[PDB]
Structures are given as structure tokens and as C-alpha cells.
């Protein structure tokens, strides 16, 4: 049997140097190295092409048949090619082909400002550009990057082993596979015959189905061959080495061990009888359990039980084990590091956790310890059960440093924490109360699970409210910054940031460039970063360390629920990890099962970060076993009504959908949402797209009313933050000095947002902006149905969330220089309308009722407690407080001095203003059960739209609500039918469409007076309306004591 | 007995017909027909560029990074793309991609002289074009490629048929092997067991010893199956069909015919006694020697004593004969063109 060995060749010295204005790129030849024979390279040619992008080449062939590009020269180790150049700066664009095929799968972009010398070499398969044919050469004849796919007990995946002669899998249990000092690879192998992808393999990883399968022996121990380091090589008739590469074993994990893993209970489990540690590390070579006092001294190491069948560890102990702290020593190969790792990790499965999150707590949800009074019969206040009971929810989408940070009137120890909801007789507390009073039904959480962003020891962390003695104490940075002298000052950081402002300006942002650095020792972030999906986070407890965290957050639950009287929803982060590899702290899920729970690429191995961060995996089972068995505890022993999935896109639909069942055996009327944009994950698994969901249950947020309503669309910057107004900026009716908006472009901003407001259905029919009947679906939103949904209860509505510009800051960058202060708190209250008083869930971001600014920050997660400021006192909506972070905004200054200085900053008046108008909407959401349908065959029965056509007047809106006969039953007792008018123009309008017919307005309006949006509405005898410039009207058709006619849909 | 038959899906007929100075081509997606979920056909773009050769494009994308040239719309068969043209003559450049990768090995010329319709159909990898969608989905679910070796007079080399339920050897000595207008595979078969590559065999054909072998039946007429075409054939426990490939036969030839036809002698052996005419052709229907005059006139036409033993055809004539011209007429299936020629 034959000896895989290296080539008898001496490293290249790359045989040609790069001159003035051309480029030399170098073929590094593995099949011309490997052989003793002279080659031919006639066949090798560069398809090479001047573009946008890359443009410094001098004159490209045009025709892709024209192979006359062949090598400039060659030697043993492969051709070259001497490339013209018009410039020395940029790069250029080179496709490496035998023909008319492509050698490298990528096209090739070399950026000579990466490569000073200009003479680069590339590898044929590889992608990669190297400096050197020695560094190409060295990474061809070494085990390189992580190629192969171990996918299950019998089939390994990789299209470098096929047609290959000698195709083996490599393995040591304790060293990495290698060439000896004779060149040979001499560790034990497996012999791979080549077969054919099996049907439920292609099934599980469509993405590799066109990858060369490989049959392993039947002698093949699977268990031990996964308890090391494993690598598939490629080798010639003689064995020379063609390639070797690492191995993606995830596939057989799953088919090895998850059916029986699956079946078990995970964490330290504490029931009567004792408590049963379970961590499920199918590779580990050794786990222990390792208790710890609450010193942090080590009170016992008792190795764990594995179960062959599941791969899973275990260990029971006595009941006293309660409150222990706790950490599993692993003994494991991970493959980014080739090594078999030794470490003490916290347990993926912990639900109590130590301060900053070092060590996992052995505890019981359940004990009366851990329960404010009364939890146990602690109810929903509002109902879930029906599409009808859904359709009702009205979203506040709250951040706990958010709410309290600022409310003197929160005792200071409470301020940024979960018992600040416990302050009864706070500004923020009470205008929560009269919010929830109005009409706002659910309460939203931003990351309240354990975030890896915030250092829970309190003496590493300053805070703005703190003396700048204890910034620079905690910030090394702040020493040897332009803010040095700020720390022998007796004053604050809050203090020195209100003395910038004085002279913060586009040309010195000063404001900012301090925030930068009082951002890294902060106690501020959204917390989209997972270090343990299944605790509370400590930093927003009173005390960090043990169990108190547990108690708290659910007696800030009782609070929402009990004395708020709103439904909770928790903001949940499934599609990434903090961090991967073994080496990071906020590594968890890697440590434990390297390569497993992580999504990585293909052909390198590399964790992706298409999430940001480290791409988690839930198309792997014992992932979505996690998921699931996460949500259950936030279920039961949290109490939480509701889910909103961070980049839902990245999860498979049949994952949520799994997890969705399961949840609601729990709690049936459990409802699940989340951001359903296209990931790119559709190669991989069916996502749980906006598309894919139609009819599933599970929501989606609509980007396409939000995109029309609030002007342009995300990552827009520049002018273009400016020139694309929305319906609420005004965009047609009264534009800005930059608009070039045409009339058909406003009139498909009305056709989205008319569809919108009656729930984004995919079949709702409606006459477009040209006067053709079209279904939802016809409705184009760039390139993509617009319309999309089967029940308005699948499609979440808004035009505010943490994430972009605050809705007042999308109107301050797009309203015209003539829309002053009053007119513009009208346009955000016009522009939150089209929301709350829409078939579709309304969602608003805390803080829109009281005219919210984040001073043009876009994305204020780590902007600290000065940019996110909501002021509950009612001074001022935090407008103009200094220049937004330059690394993410500086390209909008040049806007921002345009836009900033044109109208007033609003005040205790205009916050109440706006106040009263939110609470306004949400009363009428709530007034009739028409607003709220829930079903999308009820939308098409009774919801229609006039002033629609070619011929319509920009900026009104007019929605008709049927209760009449024609619709079926009488839905509201009260009504026959419902009008919704918004005129979003700056010129009062007429509605004659309603002749003769005998309308009202709404007793809330007409309770509101002159604080009304409706406010001069004027409805004649005659059934004329006139609506007023920039105003929502409620028009009522009042029942008579049976059910007439109302007004039916046509078509 | 299990029938062997086609995925149960309607032929395609077309969905979009190619108009006036317009050309259209459809991707007859073989995942996306295996059905379950609905396909995002994003991803799938056509680099179209104009040449000396196929000019006839109206404004082709020159940036080759350029994605932009999406489907023109899809279906459950796979998408299609309205291409826009310039003149109804002539010919079109198109390479069929999934982002900045080829679908299809060659780079395809859509003549419009050999497709008058111009609705046109490819399947990833296929490098031929079709002109229905029905044509290229019944070339997607029938016979591909010379996967399969019969190296032996039992044994036949197959990796597609590697731990496949259903392996067949269907066979046809008058026609090719295919699906009925049911798509079912009604040519008579011989069915396949899981074997071992022989010691003998590994000798003879090192360049297949990795090779998944199978055993044929005992009652297997090897000779009269080297009359025509056979095809292997693997299938689904239910009888769907997985592959369906030519089989390359020169290892069984040498097995059952060689030691035989090794100890004669080839040509028009003008002996005493006469010119005996011996060519061997194992697989030949019928062989006939022709014999034609100086002006090349037939001035006879004899069939050929086949030998049993060794698959040589004979013919023994006249000293007479001593210039005469010949060729030998044959009656033969070549698995290039899959017809008895
Ligand atoms: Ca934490
Ligand atoms: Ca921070
Ligand atoms: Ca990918
Ligand atoms: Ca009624």
C-alpha cells in the first residue's frame, strides 16, 4: 500500500520581479511540480477586463473566446503572465482559465495597495492571492484550509478528492497530521471510494450536493475517529500529495449522535432526587464537573459519564449542590487552533450565572426564593388567542438604560435596572401607565438575556453621572486623549459633555469623540451580543452575583403585566454568538462542540459573520434543540407572551416553525416574529423569509410601508437622506430644496402604504397608481412583491426601532425649510397614523410619543445614555446634543449642518402635543374591532381605499372599514361601517366620495378638541368632509338598530 | 417486481413563447423539480456578450461581476430569461451562471437557423440545447454520460450504483433504452447484486479497482446483450429513477471473446486453396463481404460464419478473387450515436 509523500522540489523564488506600470501573476503548477515531464501551457490564458471597480489594466480583450492571453513565460513550477498597466494604484480583475474554464472559482481582484511589490501568485481551486510562490507553494503541499465535509457515519464530501487516484482520511487522536522529517504521512488512514450523494444528504446539505462524495470503510470506527484531529488527503498514482485539508464533521455529529441527544435534558438539572448534570461535547476526549464555593475555591472535580449513543456527559450529585457554582473541564480537539484544548467553560444550558457571567450557578426557577409575590398566579393582561386577539397588539419597543437611566424621579440604585419598573410614582413609570391606558398593549425588551458587552463588575465600568476621575481610572485611553485634563476637574462626564456642545460643530465634533471612549467602559449597549441565551442579564440587576438577577427581572415582569398592565415580548438573538474559537471568553458554544453550533464557510472553515459576529448554526439539531429548549424556560419560568427574532432570515423555516409547536404546548397563545429579510442562506435551507411565512402564523416586520412613510430606505446617506422624502416629509405635496421626486414616484409611495395599512396581503386587491387592479403581490417594492402576507397578524408595521434614524430625525433630515415646529409634530404624529390605525401589528420604538432624537445617530448601539436619552421630565426630545459617531455618520454632516439649525428644538409644549396625539391613535386602534380584523379574508371583504387612481390627490389617504350587510355579520354593535382620512399635505382637502352618507367623528377626537389631529374637521349635513392640512380623521358611520348597508369593496 | 419509472411530475410545455426580435431561453431546474420548497432563482444570472461570430444581442452587460441579469421570470421546471435582440438571423452567446460561476461547461451559441422558435431550454451541465422544455426534462430524467464498466463476464463497475436499492442492467437489441410516454422504463432487465472486485479484475483495471462492483444473474446471455444497447439503471425503493448511464463493454469483450479470437487470423488471407476473409467484430448484428470490381461495381455480396467462441465473422472465396476489391458491410450498434449503424 502506497506512502503519501511531499514532491522532491525546493521552494520557488518567484523567477520574475514586477516593473514600473505591469503586474506579473504566477500559476504555482501542483500538477507540473509533481511531475518529473515537461508542460505544455498554450491552453492557460487570463480572461483580464477594465470595470468600475477594478480599472487599472491597459488594454483588456473584450471577447470571452479569446484565449490569445497566454503565459508571458514559464519554468517548473508553473507559467507567468507580465500584465500591462495604465496606473500603479487600484487593481485589476483576472479570471485564471485552461480554455474557456475557469482555474479559480472566485474572481480574482488584486488590490496593489495589499501587495506593494505587484509580483502575486495564485494556486488553481484556491481563491486566495499570495505574495510569494513560496507562500503559495508551502500552502499547497500543506494541510490547508477545511475543504472536506464529514456528513455522515459512511459519506465524506470534497471536490479536491475527486478523479483522484489516492483519496484517504488521515487521523491522530492526539497530534495534528503532518509530514514527517522524510516527507511521508505516516498516521493511520481510511481508504475513500468514490460514491454517489445520498437523497437524504442532498435533502440536509443542498449546498454540497454537487460536491464529490466518498464512501468510507465499513471497518471504520466512527466514535474515536471524532475524538481527534482527522484530514482528507488527495494523492497521485505514486503518492505524491496533491492535497490535504481539514475536516467539517458537523453532518456526522448530527447522524452519529443527535437522535439519542435530542432525547435528553440539558444544564444541572435540580429535581427531587438530586441534580443531573448534562453536557452534550460528542468529540470531547474527557469532561469533568468542577464546583466551586462562592469564593471561587474549588470544592470537588468529579469526571463525567458519557453515553456512546449521544455523545452527551453526565453527573449526579446530592441536592446540597444547590447555589453551586459550576464549570465543565474540557478536553477536546478544536480545529481552528489543530489542538486538544484545555479548559474550564460555563455551561450553554446555565440558567443562574456568577458576575460577569465566569461561572455558571446550579438553581431551581421554580423555588418561592426566586419569586416575587404572587407569581405563580400571574396572568396575560391581554389576550393572544385569536388572529383578532392578535391583531390588537400595539408594540413599545423599550431598552432598560433607556427607560431609567435619565428619570430623576427613579431612586438613583434603581436607575438602569430591571426594579426601575417598580418606581410607581416615577415620570417614567406613570407615562408608561397612561400609555398603557390609551392603548399600547405589549411592553418589547431590547437583549434582557445574558449580553457579553457590558462588564458587570461595576468598578470596571464608569458612567456619565459619575466624577471624570472614575472615567479615567477605569479607561486607560482617556489618560493619553484630548480630554487628559478633564481628569484633575472636580466635575462630571455629563458635566464636561454639556461644555462641549457649546462648541461642537461639524468641523470638531468634540461631543462625540469623548462619547467614543466613555462607550467602551459604559454600562450602555443594546446587547445584541449572546453570552448565555438562557439568564437574565446581571448588569441590569442590583446585584450581578448569583441569583438575584432571577428575582428581579420577574418582578419586573409582575410590574409590566400587573401593574402597567401591558404583555411582554422579548427581543431574542439565535442567528449569532458573541464570539467562536477556543481562546475567546464570551466563547461558549465553541469550546464545548468546536465547529458544530457555528455556521461556517465552505471551504475554509472559517466562522461566518454575515450576522456580524459569529454566525450560529440552527439548521444543526442540537442548535435548534437549544432554541427550543431556551424558549421554554423564557416561557415558563420567565412568563414572557411573545418572541422577536434578531435576523430571523438566518434560521431555517422549518426551525422556527418546530420551535413554535413546541412552545405552545407550553403556552398556546405564544406569538413569534422577527426580521424576515433575505439573509442569502436560501443555497443552505429554506429561510424563514417575509415570503416563505405567508400563512405559517409566525410575523414578519413590513419594511414596505416604513420605507414609503418615512422617506428613502436604510443606507441611505449623503443628500440622499435629504432628497428621498416620505409620505409624512411631505415628498411631492410640499418638497425640500433637494427633492427630484416625481409624481408617479409619490404616487407608489401611496399604493405601498394603502397596502400596508390593510395588512400587506399578498391577494388584497386594489387600483394602483396608475388605475390598473392589482393584487398585493403585483405591488412592486424594488424588485419584490410588495405585498406578501395571509392574515394581517403575520405583518408588523412601523416607522421607528432602535436600529436607523428616530423617526423626528428621518423628518428634521427630509421636511421642507417651510414646515415649521408645529407642522412637523404633526408629521411625525401623521406619519405614526398609517401604523396604529392599520390592519398589520403596530410597532413604535420607545420614545416617538415624546418626539425622540438620538441627535442623527443612525446606529446608537454603543452611543451610551447621552445620544440615547429620553428625557421623561419633558424638557426636551434630545435634538441637537451634539455631532453623531464619525466612523458611522461623519459622511451626513455636511446634511446635518443643512438640516439641523432649519426649526426649533421642541419643549415641554410640543412633547405633550405629541403626547396627546399618540395617545389619540392608540385609542381609536383600540375603539372598534373593525381597526383590527386579524383575518386576511375579513380584510378583503371589508377594507377598500378611495382618492386611488392615476388621477388622486398626493398626500391623503382614505381607508373604508365594511360592517354592512355585504360584509357579512356586525362586528362592531355600534357602527355599520369606518373611515380613516390622512391628509399628509400642507393644503386642507375634500371628501365628496361619502355623498349623502351619514358620518361622525370619533368621540375620542371629538373629546380631544383643538389637541386633536382632527382638529377643524369639518363633516357637512350634506356628507362633504374638509380635512385640514396635516390631519388624521376617524369618521364613524353610526348603526341604526340593525344592520344596513354599509360601505362594500368593489371590483 | 418493481417498475422503474420517472418522478411524478407533467411533462413542462414551455410557459413562455419567444416573440418577435426577442429570444428565450429556460433552465430546466432538476432540484427545483425534486420539488419540496420554492426555489430563489436570484442567484442564477446570464453573462450574454457580443462577438465576430453571434452578434445578435441588443445591449449585452459587459462587466462580467454584473449579477444583474436575472430571470425574467420562473415556475416550478426553473426559471427563463427574455433575452432582447437586435436581428431575428444569426446567433446569440450565452453563459448560463448561478452568480459569477458557469452552469453549463461550454459556452452555448444559440443558432437561430437549427431553433426557428427561438424558445429554446438547457440543464446545468449538459452544454446541449433543446428546443422544448419537455425535450430537456426527458434527457434530464433518462440516460447521461458512460458511468458503468462490464469488465467481466459477471461483473459490472458502477460507483453511481454504490448503495443504490434498485440496480439494474436494462437492455434493447433493436432500440435505446428509455421512458415510454408514462416514463416508465419497460425494456427487459437483469438485476444487480452488491459484489467484490475481482483479484483478476484489479490486474486488468487498476484505474477502476475503487469502483462499486456488481454481480449479474447466472442466467445472464452475455453474448446476445453485446448485440445491442444496454444501460445501467439505479433507482429509488419505489422505482424512482436516481441515474440511468451507457455501459463501456471492452472488458467483457476481451473476457469472453480474446482467448478465442487471439489464436486466428485477420484479413483477406489469399492462401492454397483459396482467400479466407476473417474480421472480428463481437458486437456486430450482421457482417457481409462485398466484393466490387475495378470500376468499383458489386460483383458480390456475402453474409459472414460468425464464430461463437470469438465474435469473428468468416467468409472463404476463390483464388479467383486474388485484386478484388472489398469492404466489409456491418450491421452494428455504436454507443456514440446509441443506433445500430
Ligand atoms: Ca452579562
Ligand atoms: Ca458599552
Ligand atoms: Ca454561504
Ligand atoms: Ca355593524
Given at each position: 500500500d502506497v506512502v503519501v509523500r511531499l514532491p522532491d522540489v525546493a521552494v520557488p523564488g518567484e523567477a520574475v520581479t514586477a516593473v514600473e506600470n505591469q503586474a506579473v501573476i504566477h500559476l504555482v503548477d501542483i500538477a507540473g511540480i509533481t511531475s518529473s515531464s515537461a508542460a505544455d501551457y498554450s491552453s492557460k490564458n487570463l480572461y483580464l477586463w477594465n470595470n468600475e471597480?477594478?480599472?487599472?489594466?491597459?488594454?483588456?480583450?473584450?471577447?470571452?473566446?479569446?484565449?490569445?492571453?497566454?503565459?508571458s513565460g514559464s519554468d517548473k513550477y508553473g507559467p507567468y503572465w507580465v500584465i500591462p498597466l495604465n496606473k500603479e494604484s487600484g487593481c485589476i480583475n483576472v479570471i485564471v482559465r485552461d480554455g474557456t474554464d475557469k482555474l479559480i472559482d472566485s474572481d480574482l481582484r488584486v488590490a496593489f495597495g495589499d501587495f506593494t511589490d505587484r509580483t502575486v501568485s495564485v494556486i488553481a481551486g484556491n481563491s486566495a492571492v499570495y505574495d510569494s510562490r513560496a507562500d503559495a507553494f508551502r500552502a499547497a503541499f500543506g494541510?490547508?484550509?477545511?475543504?472536506?465535509?464529514?456528513?455522515?457515519?459512511?459519506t465524506l464530501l470534497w471536490?479536491?478528492?475527486?478523479?483522484?487516484?489516492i483519496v484517504r482520511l488521515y487521523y491522530s487522536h492526539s497530534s495534528k497530521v503532518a509530514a514527517d522529517?522524510?516527507?511521508?504521512?505516516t498516521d493511520r488512514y481510511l481508504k475513500l471510494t468514490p460514491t454517489t450523494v445520498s437523497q437524504q444528504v442532498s435533502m440536509r446539505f443542498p449546498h454540497l450536493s454537487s460536491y464529490a462524495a466518498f464512501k468510507l470503510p465499513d471497518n471504520a470506527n466512527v466514535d474515536e475517529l471524532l475524538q481527534g484531529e482527522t484530514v482528507a488527503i488527495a494523492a497521485a498514482?505514486?503518492?505524491?500529495?496533491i492535497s490535504a485539508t481539514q475536516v467539517q464533521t458537523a453532518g456526522v455529529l448530527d447522524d452519529a449522535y443527535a437522535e439519542a441527544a435530542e432525547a435528553l435534558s440539558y444544564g444541572a438539572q435540580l429535581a427531587d432526587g438530586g441534580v443531573t448534570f448534562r453536557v452534550w461535547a460528542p468529540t470531547a476526549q474527557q469532561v469533568d464537573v468542577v464546583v466551586y464555593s462562592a469564593?471561587?475555591?474549588?470544592?470537588g472535580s468529579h469526571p463525567m459519564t458519557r453515553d456512546s449513543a449521544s455523545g452527551a456527559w453526565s453527573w449526579q450529585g446530592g441536592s446540597?449542590?444547590?447555589?453551586a457554582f459550576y464549570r465543565y473541564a474540557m478536553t477536546v480537539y478544536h480545529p481552528q487552533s489543530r489542538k486538544v484544548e484545555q479548559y474550564e467553560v460555563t455551561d450553554p444550558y446555565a440558567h443562574s450565572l456568577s458576575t460577569n457571567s465566569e461561572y455558571s450557578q446550579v438553581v431551581d426557577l421554580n423555588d418561592s426564593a426566586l419569586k416575587p409575590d404572587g407569581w405563580d398566579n400571574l396572568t396575560m393582561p391581554?389576550?393572544?388567542?385569536?388572529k383578532a386577539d392578535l391583531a390588537k397588539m400595539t408594540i413599545h419597543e423599550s431598552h432598560i438604560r433607556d427607560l431609567s437611566?435619565?428619570?430623576?424621579?427613579?431612586?438613583a440604585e434603581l436607575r438602569?435596572?430591571?426594579?426601575?419598573?417598580?418606581?410607581?410614582?416615577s415620570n417614567m413609570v406613570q407615562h408608561l401607565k397612561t400609555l398603557s391606558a390609551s392603548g399600547v398593549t405589549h411592553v418589547e425588551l431590547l437583549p434582557?438575556?445574558?449580553?457579553?458587552?457590558?462588564?458587570?463588575?461595576?468598578?470596571?465600568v464608569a458612567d456619565?453621572?459619575?466624577?471624570?476621575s472614575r472615567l479615567c481610572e477605569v479607561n486607560s485611553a482617556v489618560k493619553s486623549?484630548?480630554?487628559?485634563?478633564?481628569?484633575?476637574?472636580?466635575?462630571?462626564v455629563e458635566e464636561v459633555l454639556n461644555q462641549l456642545?457649546?462648541?461642537?460643530?461639524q468641523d470638531n465634533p468634540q461631543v462625540q469623540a469623548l462619547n467614543t471612549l466613555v462607550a467602551q467602559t459604559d454600562?450602555?449597549?443594546?446587547?445584541?451580543?449572546?453570552?448565555?441565551?438562557?439568564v437574565p442579564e446581571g448588569?441590569?440587576?442590583?446585584?450581578?452575583?448569583?441569583?438575584t438577577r432571577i428575582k428581579e427581572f420577574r418582578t419586573m415582569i409582575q410590574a409590566i403585566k400587573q401593574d402597567l398592565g401591558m404583555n411582554v415580548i422579548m427581543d431574542v438573538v439565535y442567528?449569532?454568538?458573541?464570539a467562536a474559537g477556543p481562546?475567546?471568553?464570551?466563547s461558549v458554544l465553541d469550546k464545548i462542540?468546536?465547529?458544530?453550533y457555528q455556521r461556517l464557510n465552505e471551504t475554509t472553515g472559517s466562522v461566518e459573520?454575515?450576522?456580524?459576529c459569529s454566525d450560529s448554526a440552527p439548521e444543526h439539531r442540537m442548535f435548534a434543540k437549544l432554541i427550543a429548549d431556551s424558549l421554554a424556560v423564557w416561557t415558563?419560568?420567565?412568563?414572557?407572551?411573545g418572541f422577536r427574532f434578531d435576523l430571523?432570515?438566518?434560521?431555517?423555516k422549518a426551525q422556527i416553525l418546530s420551535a413554535w409547536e413546541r412552545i405552545k404546548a407550553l403556552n398556546p397563545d405564544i406569538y413569534f416574529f422577527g426580521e424576515?429579510?433575505?439573509?442569502?442562506?436560501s443555497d443552505r435551507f429554506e429561510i424563514a423569509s417575509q415570503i416563505n411565512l405567508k400563512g405559517t402564523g409566525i410575523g414578519t416586520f413590513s419594511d414596505r410601508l416604513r420605507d414609503s412613510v418615512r422617506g428613502g430606505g436604510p443606507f441611505d446617506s449623503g443628500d440622499a437622506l435629504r432628497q428621498n422624502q416620505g409620505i409624512g416629509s411631505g415628498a411631492g405635496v410640499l418638497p425640500n430644496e433637494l427633492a427630484s421626486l416625481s409624481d408617479d414616484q409619490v404616487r407608489h409611495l401611496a399604493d405601498l402604504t394603502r397596502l400596508g395599512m390593510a395588512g400587506?396581503?399578498?391577494?388584497f386587491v386594489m387600483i394602483d397608481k396608475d388605475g390598473a387592479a392589482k393584487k398585493g403581490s403585483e405591488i412592486d417594492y424594488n424588485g419584490a412583491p410588495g405585498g406578501y402576507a395571509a392574515?394581517?397578524?403575520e405583518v408588523v408595521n412601523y416607522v421607528?426601532?432602535?436600529?436607523?434614524?428616530?423617526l423626528w430625525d428621518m423628518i428634521s433630515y427630509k421636511?421642507?425649510?417651510?414646515?415649521?415646529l408645529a407642522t412637523r409634530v404633526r408629521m411625525q404624529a401623521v406619519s405614526l397614523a398609517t401604523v396604529m390605525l392599520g390592519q398589520g401589528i403596530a410597532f413604535d420604538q420607545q420614545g416617538s410619543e415624546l418626539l425622540?432624537?438620538?441627535?442623527?445617530?443612525?446606529?446608537?448601539?454603543?452611543?451610551?445614555?447621552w445620544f440615547n436619552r429620553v428625557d421623561y421630565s419633558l424638557?426636551?426630545?434630545?435634538?441637537?446634543?451634539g455631532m453623531p459617531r464619525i466612523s458611522d455618520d461623519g459622511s451626513n454632516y455636511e446634511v446635518i449642518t443643512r438640516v439641523k439649525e432649519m426649526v426649533a428644538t421642541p419643549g415641554e409644549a410640543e412633547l405633550k402635543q405629541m403626547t396627546a396625539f399618540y395617545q389619540e391613535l392608540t385609542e381609536l386602534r383600540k375603539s372598534s374591532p373593525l381597526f383590527t380584523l386579524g383575518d386576511g379574508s375579513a380584510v378583503m371583504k371589508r377594507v377598500d381605499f378611495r382618492?386611488?387612481?392615476?388621477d388622486q390627490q398626493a398626500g391623503l389617504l382614505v381607508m373604508t372599514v365594511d360592517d354592512g350587510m355585504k360584509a357579512g355579520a356586525?362586528?362592531?354593535?355600534?357602527?355599520?361601517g369606518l373611515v380613516v382620512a390622512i391628509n399628509a399635505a400642507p393644503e386642507s382637502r375634500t371628501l365628496?366620495?361619502?355623498?349623502?352618507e351619514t358620518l361622525q367623528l370619533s368621540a375620542i377626537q371629538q373629546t380631544a378638541?383643538?389637541?386633536?389631529?382632527?382638529?377643524g374637521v369639518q363633516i357637512a349635513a350634506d356628507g362633504t368632509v374638509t380635512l385640514p392640512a396635516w390631519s388624521v380623521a376617524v369618521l364613524e358611520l353610526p348603526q341604526g338598530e340593525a344592520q344596513g348597508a354599509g360601505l362594500p369593496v368593489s371590483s
Open positions: 471597480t477594478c480599472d487599472a489594466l491597459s488594454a483588456p480583450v473584450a471577447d470571452w473566446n479569446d484565449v490569445s492571453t497566454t503565459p494541510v490547508a484550509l477545511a475543504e472536506a465535509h464529514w456528513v455522515d457515519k459512511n471536490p479536491g478528492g475527486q478523479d483522484k487516484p522529517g522524510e516527507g511521508k504521512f498514482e505514486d503518492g505524491i500529495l469564593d471561587k475555591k474549588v470544592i446540597d449542590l444547590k447555589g391581554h389576550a393572544q388567542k385569536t437611566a435619565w428619570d430623576q424621579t427613579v431612586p438602569g435596572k430591571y426594579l426601575a419598573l417598580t418606581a410607581g410614582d434582557v438575556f445574558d449580553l457579553a458587552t457590558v462588564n458587570e463588575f461595576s468598578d470596571k456619565i453621572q459619575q466624577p471624570f486623549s484630548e480630554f487628559a485634563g478633564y481628569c484633575d476637574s472636580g466635575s462630571t456642545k457649546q462648541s461642537d460643530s454600562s450602555y449597549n443594546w446587547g445584541y451580543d449572546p453570552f448565555h441565551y438562557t448588569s441590569y440587576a442590583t446585584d450581578p452575583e448569583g441569583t442567528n449569532h454568538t458573541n481562546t475567546d471568553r464570551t462542540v468546536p465547529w458544530y459573520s454575515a450576522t456580524c415558563t419560568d420567565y412568563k414572557i407572551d430571523m432570515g438566518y434560521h431555517p424576515g429579510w433575505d439573509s442569502n442562506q400587506n396581503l399578498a391577494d392574515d394581517p397578524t421607528s426601532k432602535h436600529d436607523n434614524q428616530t421636511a421642507s425649510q417651510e414646515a415649521d425622540r432624537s438620538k441627535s442623527f445617530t443612525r446606529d446608537s448601539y454603543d452611543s451610551g445614555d424638557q426636551d426630545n434630545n435634538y441637537n446634543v382618492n386611488t387612481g392615476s356586525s362586528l362592531d354593535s355600534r357602527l355599520d365628496n366620495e361619502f355623498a349623502g378638541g383643538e389637541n386633536s389631529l382632527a382638529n
